[PDB]
Design a protein around this ligand. Sequence first.
Ligand SMILES: Cc1cc2nc3c(=O)[nH]c(=O)nc-3n(C[C@H](O)[C@H](O)[C@H](O)COP(=O)(O)OP(=O)(O)OC[C@H]3O[C@@H](n4cnc5c(N)ncnc54)[C@H](O)[C@@H]3O)c2cc1C
Length: 500
Amino acid sequence: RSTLVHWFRKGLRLHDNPALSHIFTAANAAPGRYFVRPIFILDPGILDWMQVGANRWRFLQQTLEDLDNQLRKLNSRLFVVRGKPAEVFPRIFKSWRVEMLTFETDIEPYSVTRDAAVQKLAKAEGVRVETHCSHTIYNPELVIAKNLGKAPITYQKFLGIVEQLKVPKVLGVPEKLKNMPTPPKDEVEQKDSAAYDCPTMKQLVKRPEELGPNKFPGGETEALRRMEESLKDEIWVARFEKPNTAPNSLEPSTTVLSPYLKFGCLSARLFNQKLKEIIKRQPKHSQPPVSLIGQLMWREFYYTVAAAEPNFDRMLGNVYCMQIPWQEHPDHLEAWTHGRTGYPFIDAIMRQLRQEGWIHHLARHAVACFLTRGDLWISWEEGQRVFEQLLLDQDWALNAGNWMWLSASAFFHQYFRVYSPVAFGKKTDPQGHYIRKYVPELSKYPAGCIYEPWKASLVDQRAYGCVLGTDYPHRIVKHEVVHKENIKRMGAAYKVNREV
Ligand SMILES: Cc1cc2nc3c(=O)[nH]c(=O)nc-3n(C[C@H](O)[C@H](O)[C@H](O)COP(=O)(O)OP(=O)(O)OC[C@H]3O[C@@H](n4cnc5c(N)ncnc54)[C@H](O)[C@@H]3O)c2cc1C
């Protein structure tokens, strides 16, 4: 008896999962011949390559638990194998007598390299490998092909391309396993009956004092519930315009499906299909780029440009990316990273980010502009790294692509438009409720100076119980001065890049 193995990496879901569905149908179309091992590999190598904060670890933990629960309902389970894939797969290929391995493809350079090696090993041991592109709606390879070998570098060309492509068929959940015994314990399982059980919170989250509120639980089950909840107001969905949603409302002004889409707890293909059903129902509706479908297309856009550039997450060696002489300032980087810039709107966002692991798209704009072309002139790579650690939705292509946009390094070139760290939040939160919540030391400042506490006299600062320089920092830079200087620095960088 040989085993069929589905390997979760992303695609942490039962629904719309062709790679996992094929495994299951095969076992049921040929009962008694196959064992089924759905596995997730706790790969220590990924930590040399990316940062993971406490909040995102918990999200993964919760996700793996939900996925194990969901597989049990199909007379299966999740096997979480600890170790490096390069060492894990030769062992289990033999110990398990693996006939077929399936997994969902990923375009990230660490994923491509790792997957190539696994496919070289699988070819050697005579293991059949079947891969499916289901993490994105469109296959980036086919978009680039249709565009004659190059990724479209504007959203509108990208839309023009994918319009002519076939939308894939969205699958349901696999059928339960008919009369399948629990696989026999292997070398590892026999010396430890729990060697493959889902990790506890204690095993994954080493810095539990960095956990923030538990607001967006991981898991396919929570993903589907949040999607349904978000789709209930079809008028809100149909008339969604991303630029007009507030960055600093106390409740999220958008869907917060990003962590789920990032891990594949939600199929982007399913979400897209559900969105197109409402749009059909609702004749007055928004259109890309501002619409909710437009939002999913932004995800497709960045995956397509990223798939063509292994150096997408850095300035050097990146075909898309303007070469800009960013400066090194460790103290300013530290202040931004910990929301101690002295600009309450910026600090509010960076603190919501650290504590909760999600901030609105335009709040990411605000803090990203400030770090880079706007105020501090620090590389977008440094902001990417902080975002990587704290974001629940940390996504290799989307984090890099949007940082390049916000820094005017790629895709966006109107660097003379600079967010004000004082004015920008006021449009949608003139009372500063968002600042009061995340910078509570300023909570007694009136709306007239809560965005600009340095406009309050010392007497009033003492009266509000928050003296600048003691209880809340002084501004680390003066926006009105530096952002004018940085526009000149940007223009010089643009000139140098144009001449080369
Ligand atoms: C500096 C910076 C860094 C970012 N890093 C990430 C990241 O690491 N991971 C991430 O998922 N998004 C990232 N984004 C994009 C965007 O801000 C988030 O996708 C969005 O805030 C998610 O919130 P939401 O799910 O409520 O989005 P909604 O507006 O409800 O959109 C639905 C989905 O569309 C996609 N989407 C929406 N906006 C964008 C966008 N601008 N680019 C790409 N896809 C988009 C996401 O999958 C999102 O879940 C970043 C943006 C900026 C400016």
